[PDB]
Curated annotation (Swiss-Prot):
Belongs to the four-carbon acid sugar kinase family. It is an enzyme of class 2 (transferase). Its EC number is 2.7.1.219. The lineage of its organism: Bacteria, Pseudomonadati, Pseudomonadota, Gammaproteobacteria, Enterobacterales. The keyword Aminoacyl-tRNA synthetase does not apply. This is D-threonate kinase. Catalyzes the ATP-dependent phosphorylation of D-threonate to D-threonate 4-phosphate. Can also phosphorylate 4-hydroxy-L-threonine, with lower efficiency. ATP binds at residues 246, 336-339, 382. InterPro entries: 4-carb_acid_sugar_kinase_N, 4-carb_acid_sugar_kinase_N_sf, NBD_C, NBD_C_sf. Keywords: ATP-binding, Carbohydrate metabolism, Kinase, Nucleotide-binding, Transferase. Substrate binds at residues 9, 52, 82-85. It catalyses: D-threonate + ATP = 4-O-phospho-D-threonate + ADP + H(+).
Length: 400
């Protein structure tokens, strides 16, 4: 389930890394292949061969050495040779080297990044409406681009047999069978069209259906599709604890948006149960549920489903206090205002030091003199925000 990215430059390495991290990977750029070891392998390793303007033989040697070093410490999973979307550099030498080191029958070259305006049509790269050779990316200063044809570029440095699969054929349900056919026939480099990001999803699904893991070759688009397909477990060390008593439509939508995530757990508070005699045992249960979510790296959303409001706010205050004593969390989000005040009071707070605001409607700071110490606390009034407000709060806590 491990990924190796071998990129030919600084920005390519970073861009691949970012994409992996965004999809839940533990990912690092390792500066010298000589500091690679088994513990660094989970989930992704990125090597920058800094070889775009190097001699072809040097580029080849570095690329192969990166793959070999990863293999030598037990790397197993997927290898992506990150190339320039605009086809600058030692493409053929580096792809051939990576394929040799990978020791599998084929490389899938799916170079497009449609969300960045790079597509592959009939084997040629187009950038924002022009063939690549009618763009700037092709006028030196260091590394000319003499063809928009991926095959033609490759052939400057490698004579490995190639085949192109154009868009209509790419989109067929039998793509994996076609990849297998070409492999069996001795084709080594398979060059695939792409117009939209879904095409890259489809190509990676086909790659995953083969009895070996092909070498992958592409730019940000393919890297993102690979990262997505790995389905990395989303977790955070210090997750948000959210406590929401708001029954507004927008609160439901905000929670629903977070609920879509695999790293979010809801603890639902049946208002009816508050009047039952076993209320305390149920609260103990809800406390346990929240602890289990938070300690296993899920954000935890506690939400309900005159004096009624006060009964509910008091209960949520006591549940929150119970969870804090039982413990984390990375942050505390309280909504609406009645909940914010009831919870603050239950935690012994004397005030709220305001540092700023998230998403134009979520004040944040620290409670003063409370049992949550310097845990960031966020509040939101009932009715405020948009469908992504709570997602914005999750991101805030993830980043700090
Ligand atoms: O693929 C791209 O366009 C970028 O990663 C570029 O190669 C960075 O120099």
């Amino acid at each position: 389930g491990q990924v190796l990215v071998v990129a030919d430059d600084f920005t390519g390495a970073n861009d691949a890394g970012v994409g992996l991290a965004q999809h839940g990977a533990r990912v690092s750029v390792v500066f010298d292949v000589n500091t690679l070891h088994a513990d660094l392998l989970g989930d992704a390793v990125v090597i920058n061969t800094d070889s775009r303007a190097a001699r072809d033989d040097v580029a080849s040697q570095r690329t192969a050495a990166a793959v070999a070093a990863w293999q030598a410490v037990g790397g197993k999973g997927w290898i992506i040779k990150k190339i320039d979307s605009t086809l600058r550099g030692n493409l053929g030498a580096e792809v051939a080297a990576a394929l040799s080191a990978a020791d599998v029958p084929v490389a899938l070259i799916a170079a497009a990044s449609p969300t960045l305006g790079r597509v592959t049509r009939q084997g040629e790269v187009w950038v924002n409406g022009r063939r690549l050779t009618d763009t700037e990316f092709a006028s030196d200063p260091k590394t000319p681009v003499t063809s928009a044809s991926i095959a033609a570029r490759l052939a400057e440095q490698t004579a490995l047999p190639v085949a192109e699969i154009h868009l209509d054929e790419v989109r067929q349900a039998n793509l994996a069978h076609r990849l297998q056919q070409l492999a069996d026939e001795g084709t080594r480099l398979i060059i695939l069209d792409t117009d939209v990001q879904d095409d890259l999803t489809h190509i990676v699904n086909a790659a995953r259906a083969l009895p070996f893991r092909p070498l992958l070759v592409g730019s940000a688009g393919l890297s993102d599709a690979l990262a997505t397909a790995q389905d990395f477990t989303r977790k955070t060390e210090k997750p948000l604890l959210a406590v929401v008593g708001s029954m507004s439509d927008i609160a439901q939508k905000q929670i629903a948006a977070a609920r879509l995530r695999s790293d979010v757990t809801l603890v639902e508070i049946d208002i009816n149960a508050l009047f039952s005699p076993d209320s305390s045992t149920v609260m103990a249960s809800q406390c346990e549920d929240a602890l289990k979510a938070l300690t296993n790296g899920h954000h935890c959303i506690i939400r309900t489903c005159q004096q009624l409001g006060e009964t509910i706010s008091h209960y949520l205050g006591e549940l929150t206090r119970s969870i804090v004593q039982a413990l984390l969390p990375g942050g505390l989000y309280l909504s609406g205002g009645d909940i914010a005040i009831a919870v603050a009071t239950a935690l012994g707070a004397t005030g709220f030091q305001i540092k700023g605001q998230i998403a134009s409607c979520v004040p944040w700071g620290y409670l003063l003199n409370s049992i949550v110490g310097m845990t960031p606390v966020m509040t939101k009034a009932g009715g405020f925000g948009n469908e992504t407000t709570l997602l914005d709060v999750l991101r805030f806590i993830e980043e700090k």
